């Protein structure tokens, strides 16, 4: 009922990559200005838009939607200064708002509301600092979904505006001196050209700069930059005596830093240029993240020579690695997901326990397990509690609990922890749904952890909808969240809900991170694909009638899977993926992403990509019964992320090597959505309308009833 575009092919568009020559027809997509690409735009926009209303399945569940996604949302209290701020959308709200109270009694009010800022949401909070006192505050606001940030300040008392403005910034700290005087943060040099997201320019020459509060930015002050590393960026930040500058240099996404220290009382007058840099770890052979001090003996969580990581204290007086002391030995399992130092002597360790948090208590002195805090099946998402702080925060999460926000008061000699708030969604009976954790091998055997979830009951017959999602890589782990948006799916359209947590990510450690990158890139795809394989002989669902989503680096798993078995599934949710393997070293910030992937500069990292790049494998298979299933390309014109250049030549290759087949009859879209991004900061409404389309689309392609 509808028919695809022309879109001009460049049959001259060959380029060599080591001997070898391949042909990129829509290179010229790679324009986002030009008229060209405006009209492919506009084009592919005026077939999907339609099919995806024509579902009477939309609205219903954008219904539906809007009052299941209709409660409280909020965030963990945290106390800077003498005050208590959080974060409360009411339920609908585009953007959550930041309050601030005098008391945990207290009546709060309204601090930073960014829904006063843009008519439609589109304008997001991204980043604030407050000073040590906590008597300023520092924000970063961007606009249309672009990782660029405006950084803005004020006066806490009275919420008062300031006048300082940074611009330029990007991947940026934010790190106030502990006199108040001034704040570090990154920003990149004036470059020709635009800058507001839309652009594909690459970020190279990250810098340091100080600002000076109550001043110009022009009179900033350069503190750290490296002209013969255009790639490395420095992030830094304060120890808690605020005596010394703690800069983390990192190169790419590997979880390595390199650890520089600046002490500032060394310092002749201040900071008035280049600081005087001890480069105490000058590699990238560990990560090393800062937790506290105690004098000159910094405690450090590391992944040196421990890929589940630990904590160790260096002496800066007596550096040397043969003088470490391991405070808390790595888990043989557990992953130490991160730590805090909170009342002064006492440590959070968040672990991860078989793709599930843990809390506990620990001793700063000794490293002594001290206390563990019972919690259910799910993960922590939420924390609070300084050094300075005698009382903690923290915020539960599962896939049928919304939130349990718990405190505990540290000053007492039992310590119990109470549920502080409790948030509830109606219209769900969590005991009709059942969670389940199951373990399967993998091609090589490797067993692989995977979540599912479905009403209580269910006949496994294969004979329903299943919504399989995943990542895979740089070390993100997919642990359980809530998501009103699938719950329908399972809900009023009969669906079982799974999660793979194949190699690639952090489940298990950095072992489990190299497990599925560089060439070993593969055994995300196949993983992935054995756990489709195995909820259709496990009964729960068939091909037919399996749907995959991932976004981002899971964009370019699920794509590169619809690419190797298109057999196995019946439709494909890829959104705001990589696809062009070959370049995406070559747009804004996508030179980090090499550490994973590699780079097609090298004949080595050239020769696994070409076997798996989304682009440069889509094929129609030689088998009559055999089409590609259904797609739906989700991007953005802000998406400064991974271009939406990525989309744009992937599906214009789809459209003309498939979509033309006759046998072909499901269908091949893409929406670009405006005034967004990579996802960060998307304002509610905006998000509403995407998984109505991603729903619709399943429903309308695989011919789901709704179900009341
Ligand atoms: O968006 C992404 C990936 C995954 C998440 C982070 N990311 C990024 O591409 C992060 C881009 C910006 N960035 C770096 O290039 N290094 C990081 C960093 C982030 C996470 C882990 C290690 C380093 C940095 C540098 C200095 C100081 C602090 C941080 C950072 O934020 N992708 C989209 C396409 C596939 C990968």
């Known amino acids: 009922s509808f028919q695809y575009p022309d879109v001009y092919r460049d049959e001259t568009a060959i380029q060599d990559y080591h001997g070898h020559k391949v042909c990129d027809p829509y290179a010229w997509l790679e324009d986002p200005d030009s008229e060209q690409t405006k009209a492919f735009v506009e084009a592919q926009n005026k077939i999907t838009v339609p099919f995806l209303e024509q579902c009477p399945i939309r609205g219903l569940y954008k219904e539906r939607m809007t009052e299941l996604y209709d409660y409280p949302k909020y965030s963990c209290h945290f106390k800077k200064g003498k005050r208590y701020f959080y974060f409360y959308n009411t339920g609908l709200q585009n953007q959550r708002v930041l309050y601030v109270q005098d008391s945990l009694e207290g009546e709060a009010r309204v601090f930073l509301d960014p829904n006063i800022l843009s008519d439609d949401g589109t304008v997001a909070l991204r980043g604030y600092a407050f000073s040590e006192d906590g008597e ?6 961007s606009a249309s979904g672009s990782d660029w940030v405006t950084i803005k300040f004020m006066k806490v008392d009275g919420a008062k505006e300031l006048p300082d403005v940074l611009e330029r910034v990007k991947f940026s700290c934010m790190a106030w001196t502990h006199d108040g005087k001034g704040m570090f943060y990154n920003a990149y ?29 022009s009179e900033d002050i350069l503190c750290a930059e490296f002209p013969d590393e255009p790639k490395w960026m420095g992030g830094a930040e304060l120890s808690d005596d605020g005596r010394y500058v703690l800069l983390s240099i990192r190169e790419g996404c590997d979880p390595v830093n390199r650890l520089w220290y600046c002490d500032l009382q060394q310092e002749s007058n201040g900071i008035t240029g280049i600081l005087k840099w001890v480069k105490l770890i000058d590699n990238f052979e560990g990560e090393y993240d800062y937790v506290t001090n105690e004098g000159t003996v910094f405690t450090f ?8 990581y630990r904590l160790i204290n260096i002496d800066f007086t007596d550096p040397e690695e043969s003088k470490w002391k391991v405070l808390v030995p790595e888990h043989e399992k557990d992953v130490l997901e991160w730590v805090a130092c909170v009342r002064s002597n006492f440590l959070v360790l968040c672990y991860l326990h078989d793709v599930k948090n843990t809390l506990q208590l620990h001793d700063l002195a000794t490293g002594a397990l001290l206390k563990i805090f019972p919690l259910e099946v799910g993960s922590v998402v939420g924390y609070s509690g300084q050094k300075k702080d005698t009382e903690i925060f923290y915020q539960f999460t599962s896939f049928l609990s919304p939130g349990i926000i718990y405190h505990c008061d540290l000053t007492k000699e039992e310590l119990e922890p109470r549920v502080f708030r409790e948030v509830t969604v109606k219209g769900i009976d969590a005991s009709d749904y059942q969670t389940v954790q199951i373990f399967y091998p993998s091609k090589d055997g490797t067993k692989i952890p995977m979540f599912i979830v479905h009403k209580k009951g269910i006949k496994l017959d294969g004979s329903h909808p299943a919504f399989l999602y995943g990542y895979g890589g740089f070390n993100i782990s997919i642990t359980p969240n809530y998501s009103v948006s699938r719950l329908i799916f399972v809900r009023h359209m009969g669906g ?4 793979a947590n194949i190699r690639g990510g952090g489940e298990y450690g950095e072992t489990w991170h190299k497990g599925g990158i560089l060439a070993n890139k593969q055994n995300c795809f196949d993983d992935f694909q054995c756990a489709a394989e195995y909820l259709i002989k496990e009964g729960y669902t068939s091909p037919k009638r399996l749907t995959i989503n991932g976004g981002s680096n899971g964009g370019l798993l699920v794509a590169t899977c619809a690419n190797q078995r298109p057999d196995l599934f019946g439709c494909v949710i890829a959104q705001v993926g990589v696809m062009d393997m070959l370049k995406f070293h070559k747009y804004t910030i996508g030179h980090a992403w090499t550490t994973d992937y590699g780079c097609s500069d090298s004949k080595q990292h050239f020769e696994w990509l070409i076997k798996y790049s989304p682009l440069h494998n889509v094929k129609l298979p030689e088998a009559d019964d055999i089409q590609y299933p259904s797609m739906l390309l989700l991007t953005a014109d802000h998406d400064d992320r991974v271009v939406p250049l990525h989309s744009l030549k992937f599906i214009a290759t789809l459209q003309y090597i498939v979509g033309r087949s006759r046998k072909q009859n499901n269908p091949l ?8 991004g990579h996802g960060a900061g998307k304002p509610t409404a905006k998000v509403i309308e995407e998984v109505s389309d991603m729903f619709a689309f399943i429903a309308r392609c695989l011919n789901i009833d709704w179900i009341p």
Do not use: C, M, W
């Open 301 to 308: 969580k590391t992944n040196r020579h421990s890929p589940n």
């Open 669 to 676: 879209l893409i929406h670009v959505d405006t005034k967004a």
């Open 136 to 141: 300023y505050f520092a924000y970063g606001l």
């Open 189 to 217: 040099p004036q470059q020709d050209g635009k800058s507001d997201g839309t652009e594909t320019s690459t970020n190279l020459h990250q810098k340091l700069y100080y600002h000076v509060l109550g001043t110009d930015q």
């Open 496 to 499: 079982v809900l799974a999660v």
